[PDB]
Design an enzyme around this catalytic site. Structure first.
Site, PDB file in Angstrom:
ATOM      1  N   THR A 121       0.842  -1.197   0.000  1.00  0.00           N
ATOM      2  CA  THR A 121       0.000   0.000   0.000  1.00  0.00           C
ATOM      3  C   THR A 121       0.874   1.242   0.000  1.00  0.00           C
ATOM      4  OG1 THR A 121      -2.055  -0.877   0.992  1.00  0.00           O
ATOM      5  CG2 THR A 121      -1.521   1.481   1.405  1.00  0.00           C
ATOM      6  N   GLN A 122       0.691   2.078  -1.015  1.00  0.00           N
ATOM      7  CA  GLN A 122       1.551   3.225  -1.184  1.00  0.00           C
ATOM      8  C   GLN A 122       0.763   4.524  -1.426  1.00  0.00           C
ATOM      9  OE1 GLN A 122       3.620   2.938  -5.121  1.00  0.00           O
ATOM     10  NE2 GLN A 122       3.336   0.695  -5.040  1.00  0.00           N
ATOM     11  N   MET A 168      -1.825  -6.166  -2.128  1.00  0.00           N
ATOM     12  CA  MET A 168      -2.002  -4.910  -1.379  1.00  0.00           C
ATOM     13  C   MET A 168      -0.783  -4.003  -1.515  1.00  0.00           C
ATOM     14  SD  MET A 168      -4.961  -4.625  -0.271  1.00  0.00           S
ATOM     15  CE  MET A 168      -5.051  -3.460   1.107  1.00  0.00           C
TER      16      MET A 168
END
Lengths: 233, 122
Positions: free
Chosen positions: A1-2, A107
């Site tokens: 997740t970024q 993710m």
């Protein structure tokens, strides 16, 4: 997740009687800062395929080199890498699509929206889209970001149903794309005057135009606009 | 005593590795292949034995490419040669990936060299 850092705005494109066109401006923004003006965001793979990428530019560069690895590896133990077993637009798409959905599923997305444009060997036009979720779709016109909202309506006025495609010429197609790029420049706060455009035609092959500028802009009427309501001077 | 030539990493009493030397006999039984270094490049040629008229020409390709700029050819046990090229390919990708520049030939040579040597250790 970024979270994306350096970004590229719309990629827009459509298909005409003989092939496809795809366009993208030459800018990487850093939030509100218009940071980099040399960014090529149209990635040609072979001579039947151009891949336009919007979204995070570090992730684009990564995808960009994946594509080179893909061309190198195709040519391993392949005496037909320059015909018959050369890379096909749909192959390059299914791969990207596979990676996108896989990264989403971990993710840890490749923070992008991609449009794959080209002409298949049989002659059929290829135009498909995949994004950072692995969602995919095809339409006679396609666009990412603002292009989705402002470019698509202009482009669908030319190609509104599949039956319109063999009717649409390259000149007409190319016209629409250029006008759309100008409208985007008028109304997208993360966009750039300078842009690149590529045409992949079933008879002329790949034609790649760099360093195009938006021309023919109407600005004159701005002299008459005074105040925001009651001011006369 | 005797039997120094039964296991791969064993030094004979004169300091040799007989299994390696036996492998060399398999190379010698191979078809012949060559490289000619010219003033701006390299040529590679190889002998393809036509056992029968049933073979297809020229459809049994022996020369291999590593990355985009490296040619390999080999004599001997062929599947061994492909295994080695496979390893050269991974190695050249890994090098480009990190260092951006495609692998220089001496660097690449050493990559196979260290890996071939490795199979004379255990």
């Amino acid at each position: 997740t970024q979270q994306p850092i350096v970004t590229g705005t719309s990629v827009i494109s459509m298909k005409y009687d003989n092939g496809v066109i795809i366009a993208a401006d030459n800018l990487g923004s850093y939030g509100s800062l218009l940071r980099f003006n040399g960014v090529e965001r149209l990635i040609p793979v072979g001579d039947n395929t151009v891949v336009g990428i919007s979204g995070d530019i570090s992730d684009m560069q990564h995808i960009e080199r994946l594509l080179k690895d893909l061309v190198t590896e195709n040519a391993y133990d392949n005496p037909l890498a320059d015909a018959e077993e050369a890379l096909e637009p749909s192959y390059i798409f299914e791969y990207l699509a596979t990676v996108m959905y896989q990264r989403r599923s971990k993710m840890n997305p490749l923070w992008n929206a991609i449009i794959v444009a080209g002409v298949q060997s049989n002659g059929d036009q290829f135009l498909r889209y995949v994004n950072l979720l692995g969602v995919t779709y095809s339409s006679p016109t396609l666009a990412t970001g603002f292009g989705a909202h402002m470019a698509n309506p202009l482009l669908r006025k030319v190609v509104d149903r599949e039956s319109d495609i063999p009717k649409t010429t390259v000149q007409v197609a190319e016209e629409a794309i250029v006008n759309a790029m100008r409208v985007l420049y008028y109304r997208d706060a993360r966009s750039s005057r300078n842009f690149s455009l590529a045409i992949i035609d079933k008879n002329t092959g790949l034609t790649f135009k760099k360093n195009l500028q938006v021309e023919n802009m109407k600005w004159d009427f701005a002299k008459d606009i005074k105040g925001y309501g009651t001011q006369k001077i | 005593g005797t039997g120094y030539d039964l296991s791969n990493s064993v030094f004979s009493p004169d300091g040799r590795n007989f299994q390696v030397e036996y492998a060399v006999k398999a190379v010698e039984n191979g078809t012949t292949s060559i490289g000619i270094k010219c003033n701006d490049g390299v040529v590679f040629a190889v002998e393809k034995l036509i056992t029968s008229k049933l073979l297809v020409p020229q459809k049994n390709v022996k020369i291999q490419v590593v990355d985009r700029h490296i040619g390999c050819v080999y004599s001997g046990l062929i599947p061994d040669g492909r295994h080695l090229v496979n390893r050269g390919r991974e190695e050249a990708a890994s090098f480009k990936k990190l260092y951006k520049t495609p692998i220089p030939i001496p660097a690449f040579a050493d990559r196979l060299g260290q890996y071939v040597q490795a199979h004379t250790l255990y």
